[PDB]
Structures are given as C-alpha cells and as structure tokens.
Amino acid sequence: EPFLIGVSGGTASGKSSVCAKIVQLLQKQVVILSQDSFYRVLTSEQKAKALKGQFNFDHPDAFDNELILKTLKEITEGKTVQIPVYDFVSHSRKEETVTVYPADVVLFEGILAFYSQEVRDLFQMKLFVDTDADTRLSRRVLRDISERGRDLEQILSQYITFVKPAFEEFCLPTKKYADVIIPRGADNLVAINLIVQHIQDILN
Ligand SMILES: O=c1ccn([C@@H]2O[C@H](COP(=O)(O)OP(=O)(O)OP(=O)(O)O)[C@@H](O)[C@H]2O)c(=O)[nH]1
Numbered sequence: 001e002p003f004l005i006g007v008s009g010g011t012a013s014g015k016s017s018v019c020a021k022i023v024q025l026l027q028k029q030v031v032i033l034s035q036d037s038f039y040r041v042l043t044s045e046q047k048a049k050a051l052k053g054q055f056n057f058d059h060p061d062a063f064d065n066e067l068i069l070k071t072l073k074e075i076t077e078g079k080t081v082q083i084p085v086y087d088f089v090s091h092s093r094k095e096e097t098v099t100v101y102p103a104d105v106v107l108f109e110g111i112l113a114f115y116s117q118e119v120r121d122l123f124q125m126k127l128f129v130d131t132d133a134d135t136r137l138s139r140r141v142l143r144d145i146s147e148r149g150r151d152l153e154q155i156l157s158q159y160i161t162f163v164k165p166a167f168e169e170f171c172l173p174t175k176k177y178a179d180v181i182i183p184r185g186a187d188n189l190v191a192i193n194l195i196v197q198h199i200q201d202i203l204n
Contacts, residue, residue: 001077002102002106003104003105003106003125004076004122005105005106005107005108005124005127005199006108006122006123006126007109007126008113008127008178009130009131009182009185010111010171011163011167012143013136013185014131014139014185015109015110015111015129017186018127018192019032019107020186021186022192023107026199026200028104028105028203030104032107032109033100033109035109036086038064038067038068038071038084039057039086039093040061040063041064041092041093042091047092053150053155053162055091055158056166058111058162058165058170059166060112063110064084068116075103076122080100081099082097083098088147089148089149105199105203114174114178115170120177124202125195126177126178127180127182127195128177130182131185133164137159141155
C-alpha cells in the first residue's frame with residue numbers, strides 16, 4: 001500500500017514547499033496532492049460572494065470532503081485516480097482533470113487535511129507547518145495579487161473576516177494530531193531531514 005503523509009498548517013504557511021523539499025530529499029515514486037484541488041463547485045450566488053471576499057473558503061464545508069475521502073481511499077488501494085483542478089481566479093472547478101498513477105509515497109497538503117477523522121486516519125504520518133501569522137499574511141497578499149488575480153482590500157477583508165477566525169477555530173486545533181510540528185516551515189531543514197530519514201526507514 002502507498003505510504004500516506006498528511007500535511008497541514010495555516011494559509012501560506014509553506015505546506016507546499018515543505019512537501020517539495022521532502023520529495024527533493026527522498027527509487028521511490030512520489031506524488032504531491034493538495035486539498036485545494038477539491039474545493040466545492042460553487043453556485044452563482046456563492047461565487048458572487050467569493051468575488052467580494054465574502055465567502056468562507058476556510059470552513060471545513062468549503063471542501064468537497066466526500067470526494068476527497070473517496071479519492072484518497074482509492075489511492076490507498078493502489079488504484080490510479082483522476083483529480084480535479086481548481087481555478088482560484090474564478091473560484092471554479094475546471095473541466096479538465098489530472099491523472100495520478102500509483103506511487104510509493106503520497107503527500108496530501110491543505111489547510112484542513114486533519115479535520116475530518118476519516119481522512120485523518122488515512123495518513124500514516126501527519127505534519128503541521130507552523131509559521132508566524134504576519135509572515136503568512138504577507139505571503140497570502142503577494143500570492144493572491146500575483147497568482148489569483150485579487151485586490152489587496154478584498155484580500156485583507158476576507159482574511160480578517162474569514163481566514164483568521166477559521167484558522168483559530170478549525171485549522172489550529174488540528175495541530176494536536178500531528179506526529180511532527182514544523183516551525184519556520186520549509187526553512188527548518190533539520191526537521192525536514194529527520195522526517196525524510198524517518199520516511200526512508202519505514203520504507204525499509
Ligand atoms: O476560491 C478560493 C479557494 C481558496 N481560497 C483561500 O486559499 C486559502 C488556503 O489555501 P493555501 O493558503 O493553503 O495555499 P497552499 O496550498 O499553496 O499553501 P502554502 O504551500 O502556501 O502553505 C484558504 O485560506 C482559502 O480561503 C481563496 O481565497 N479562494
């Protein structure tokens with residue numbers, strides 16, 4: 001069975017980078033999947049909210065949890081799967097899909113990957129990335145403006161109204177489920193090294 005590794009942390013905490021550095025340091029076939037690929041398909045009314053940064057994309061229910069549970073279960077079974085592609089500029093699931101063939105190690109990262117216990121128990125290892133809040137926001141702002149075509153004021157408004165409150169209420173609590181907590185994120189090469197060393201040992 002593939003070795004499942006769940007990765008979480010707050011928004012722009014560097015979960016993706018951590019996953020990349022882990023793969024970089026890890027022949028084993030490895031693939032990185034993100035919880036973001038499974039955001040729910042929004043109605044026109046909800047999408048309208050999103051355009052004004054008035055939609056909560058940080059609440060457990062913003063994700064298509066059923067699809068996630070099912071997709072991850074199939075990977076666990078060694079079956080090749082199809083994975084959705086989300087568009088952050090339109091807040092909409094694209095028609096195109098991405099094929100993901102079997103692998104020895106699978107990394108799953110998302111702001112709420114440890115929330116649902118069903119999903120949580122599918123991970124043989126769970127990592128939580130801990131980064132300073134102002135550092136996280138700074139990134140969020142530049143990344144949102146740069147890669148997701150958004151406006152500063154709409155970003156800050158959505159962050160203060162939804163992201164932060166959701167982080168404290170839904171995300172942060174899940175840190176208790178982590179087997180390893182990683183402060184400073186991707187930059188904590190020592191912690192990442194022990195982790196890849198631990199992953200390597202188990203695969204032996
Ligand atoms: O349509 C959407 C969907 C999601 N989001 C917002 O994206 C946010 C989280 O998605 P992430 O911040 O976790 O991005 P990432 O997977 O690349 O993480 P890092 O590697 O940078 O750590 C959530 O905080 C959600 O509100 C939107 O702004 N719009």
